[PDB]
Symmetry: C2
Subunit: 238 residues, 2 copies
C-alpha cells in the first residue's frame, strides 16, 4: 500500500500549520516519520506551497504539487498514475503522533474486503463527548459496515441516559483507506444533499449505495494538532 | 397480489380492550378491516388471542386467525398467521396496525406494490416532519434515506443532524426530516425466517425492531406516504378526535 498526506496550509489559529516546529522538525515531517513506520511503499505529501515542499524534500520525502481534501488525493492519484487496485491510505497532516499500526490496520482492512472504503473508530466513554457534535458517531452492522455516520448522538440510548454512557458508542476517526480506482470514481459523483446537511463528506458514499467498513482502532490515537493548546500538548509529549 | 394481516393489540393501559373501542357503532378493529378491504387485498386476517375480538371481527364478515396467548411481538404474531394459513413463501404480506381506523387504502397498496417491484427484505413508509418539537421528540422515529429511498438508519435521535442550524439553536428545523410510519410489507418466506434471527443489540438500545433488518445486511425500502395519514388511536384524546 501507499500513503498520501494532504497538508492543508491555511488555518485560523495555526497559520503555517504543516511547518509549525515540533522539537526541531516541522509537523509534516513528523507525520512522514509515522507513515514510513507503517511500512508504506510510497509516502506522498500533497501541497501547493513551495516552503512545505522544500521541508518534506529536505527530510527525504516525496512531494506532489497540487492545483477540497479528497479531490487533492484524486490529483495525486492521477499525477502518479497508480493502477486502479492500488491501496491508498489518507493520513491527515495534523497528526504527528498517529501510531503506524492503525495506518497499517486500515490498509489490511481494505485489502482483505471487496469494498470501496475502509475506516476506523474508537469507543466513546463520556457524555460530554457523546453529545458533542464535533465528535462524529457511527453505527455498524454485524459485519462492521457503517449503517450511518452522524453528529447526532447515535444510537440513541434512552437507558444509559437517564442515570447521569455505557459501551455502545463509537467515535469515527478521520483516517481512510480506498483503492485508487474508487477515488477516481468518487470525486466525479455529484455531491449528495445529506453531506451538506450533516457536513460529513463520507455520507456521499452511503447515499450512492456503496459500503464503508469500520474496524475498532487497535490503538487509540491522540487528538490532532488544530490549536495552540494542541501544539503545546504535543510538544511536551514528543 | 397481496394479503393484509392486522395484529390487534388487546391489553393497553389508557385504552384497554383497544381493538373493541366503539367508533360510531363499530369497533376500531372493524374500521381497520374496512380500510384493508378497500386496498384490493385478496385476504384480510385479524390476528388475536381474544374471543371477544374474534367474534366482533367475524360478525362483520372478517377472517380471524387465533394466535398464542404466550406474549408475541406484532411480527411474531404475523409469522404464526403465515404458518397457520399456509401461505407460500412468495406471498406479499402487509402488516397494518390495529389502531388505524382512518388509514387510506391507497397507502396500503403503495407498500405492497413497493415490495413487489424491488427484491428487498422489507418495504415501509415515511412522512415529513414540520415542527422542531417533533424533530426532537424521541417518540417520533426518524429515518434517513439513500438516493434510491432505502433506509440508512432509523433512530429516536434527531437525524440527520443539521450542524450549522443546531450550532445556533435547537429552536428551528428545515424541511428534510422524515418520520417513520409503522406499516410494513414483506414476503411470507422472509417473515418466517426473520422472527427466528437473534436480535440485534441495536434493537434494545433504540427500541426499534426493524433495525434487525439493517443489522443483518438486508435492505428496507422507504417511500414518502402518498397520502399523509392520521394519527393512530393511542389515547382517549386520539379516540375523541377520531370519532368526528
Amino acid at each position: 500500500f501507499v500513503v498520501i498526506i494532504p497538508a492543508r496550509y491555511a488555518s485560523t489559529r495555526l497559520p503555517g500549520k504543516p511547518l509549525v516546529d515540533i522539537n526541531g522538525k516541522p509537523m509534516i515531517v513528523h507525520v512522514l516519520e509515522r507513515a514510513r513506520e507503517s511500512g508504506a511503499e510510497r509516502i506522498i505529501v500533497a501541497t501547493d506551497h513551495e516552503d512545505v515542499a522544500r521541508a518534506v524534500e529536505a527530510a527525504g520525502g516525496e512531494v506532489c504539487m497540487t492545483r477540497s481534501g479528497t479531490e487533492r488525493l484524486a490529483e495525486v492519484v492521477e499525477k502518479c498514475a497508480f493502477s486502479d487496485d492500488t491501496v491508498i491510505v489518507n493520513v491527515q497532516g495534523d497528526e504527528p503522533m498517529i501510531p503506524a499500526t492503525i495506518i497499517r490496520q486500515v490498509a489490511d482492512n481494505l485489502a482483505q474486503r471487496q469494498v470501496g472504503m475502509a475506516t476506523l473508530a474508537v469507543p466513546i466513554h463520556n457524555a460530554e463527548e457523546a453529545f458533542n457534535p464535533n465528535a462524529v458517531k457511527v453505527v455498524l452492522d454485524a459485519e462492521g459496515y457503517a449503517l450511518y455516520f452522524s453528529r447526532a448522538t447515535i444510537p440513541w440510548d434512552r437507558d444509559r441516559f437517564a442515570e447521569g454512557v455505557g459501551d455502545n458508542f463509537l467515535r469515527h476517526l478521520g483516517i481512510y483507506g480506498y483503492r485508487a480506482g474508487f477515488i477516481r470514481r468518487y470525486v466525479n459523483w455529484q455531491p449528495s444533499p445529506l453531506e451538506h446537511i450533516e457536513m460529513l463528506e463520507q455520507l456521499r458514499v452511503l447515499w450512492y449505495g456503496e459500503k464503508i467498513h469500520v474496524a475498532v482502532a487497535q490503538e487509540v490515537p491522540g487528538t490532532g494538532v488544530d490549536t495552540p493548546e494542541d501544539l503545546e500538548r504535543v510538544r511536551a509529549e514528543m
